[PDB]
Amino acid sequence: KKQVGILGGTFNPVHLAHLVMAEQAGRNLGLDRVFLMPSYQTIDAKHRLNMLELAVEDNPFLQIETIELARGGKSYTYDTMKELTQNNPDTDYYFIIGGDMVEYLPKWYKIDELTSMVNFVGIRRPGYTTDTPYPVIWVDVPEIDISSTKIRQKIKEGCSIRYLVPDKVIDYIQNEGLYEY
Amino acid sequence: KKQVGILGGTFNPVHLAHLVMAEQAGRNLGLDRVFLMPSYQTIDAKHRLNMLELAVEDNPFLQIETIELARGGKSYTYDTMKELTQNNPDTDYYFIIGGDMVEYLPKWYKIDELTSMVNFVGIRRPGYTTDTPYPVIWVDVPEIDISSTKIRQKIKEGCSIRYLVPDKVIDYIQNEGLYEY
Ligand SMILES: Nc1ncnc2[nH]cnc12
Ligand SMILES: Nc1ncnc2[nH]cnc12
Ligand SMILES: [Mg+2]
Ligand SMILES: [Mg+2]
């Protein structure tokens, strides 16, 4: 009986806050490992995946779940977790979301069933409340106020992203000429 | 005429927020480089300095200013900047502080003279105001809610510090058996 975390996102590009959130939530709960799960869709997914793999490269605790990139199309989270739980029927999944996202959990397709499928884990964040419907358990993570949009904006404006983004990922962005449009 | 940033702290231990604050403040202002300036004083300074040098190792933009470790004793910031400006009379110093510290600027010894010596740079932070006496100019930095005390507490409790602290610094802490008391 495995316990596995999932951190979803576009990861466009992956950055330090993704790594801290995944490692801290998983390690604090004592999960076996945490997967960063890129969503489908504008740069090609191969790039997002290469950067993701570079970012988690040296750390067996963090891995990449690619099922959403392969299946494409609709991708409601319920459908994804339904495939993952059928593939891994003895795995307890811990679906990690930022405290800010916990509010929109009603907008989630078949959130009813989804909460019976997986364990939602909220990341306590300043400003947003620790209250919600649905069974969410919470974990404390140092606030890291970085977002992929912020990074892309900094790249577009020609500002530094060092330490906000892993060195191997910065090198890839520059080698492939990403985000400078 | 050089423009040089200074980021003071105990750095006990150095961590990701120190590196982001220093790099972002310096790069956003277009400074020539930024020095992390460890204060005097309980682990020996050699350790704090070794970790600092490991942390900035691969980045010519960030350096370590050791004058406070060498002079010891009182160490009012005014005295330190007085020595540094006499040593480097054509350098304009930019003294970087967190937005939270800008409030206590009156508690600073000879803050009057100190503001004529250097340029204070405040780091805009959530919660704390962008108002103050004294001539402070401000720079935006992604909020990174890490502190040396937090890290030490995590080490003492046996929690993960990966990504919160550079890999070379984690290795040193573990190699020297620091902070696990
Ligand atoms: N929801 C998200 N997906 C991918 N990257 C992010 N960075 C910040 N938020 C993100
Ligand atoms: N004032 C400070 N000095 C050294 N390390 C810190 N980490 C957070 N705040 C610090
Ligand atoms: Mg299984
Ligand atoms: Mg000079």
Q: What's the quick description here?
A:
It is classed as transferase. With 181 residues, chain A is of the alpha/beta class. Chain A contains seven helices and six strands.
SSE topology:
The structure is a homodimer of 181-residue chains.
Chain A: E1 2-9, H1 16-29, E2 33-38, H2 45-55, E3 62-64, H3 67-71, H4 77-87, E4 91-98, H5 111-117, E5 119-124, E6 136-140, H6 148-157, H7 167-176
Helix pairs in contact in A: 2-7, 4-5
Bound molecules: adenine (2 copies) and magnesium ion (MG) (2 copies).
One magnesium ion binds next to loops of chain B.
Write up what this structure looks like.
Two copies of one chain form a homodimer. The first copy, chain A, has 181 residues and is an alpha/beta fold. Chain A has one domain (1-181). Helix content of chain A is 38%, strand content 20%. The first copy, chain A, contains seven helices and six strands. Chain A has helices spanning 16-29, 45-55, 67-71, 77-87, 111-117, 148-157, 167-176, and strands at residues 2-9, 33-38, 62-64, 91-98, 119-124, 136-140. A six-stranded parallel beta sheet of chain A has the order 3-2-1-4-5-6. In chain A, strand 4 (91-98), helix 5 and strand 5 form a beta-alpha-beta unit. In chain A, helix 2 (45-55) runs antiparallel to helix 7 (167-176). The longest helix of chain A is centred in the N-terminal third of the chain and has 14 residues, at 16-29. Chain A is globular, with a radius of gyration of 16 Å. Chain A starts with a strand and ends in a 5-residue tail after the last helix. One adenine binds at residues 9-11, 147-148 of chain B.
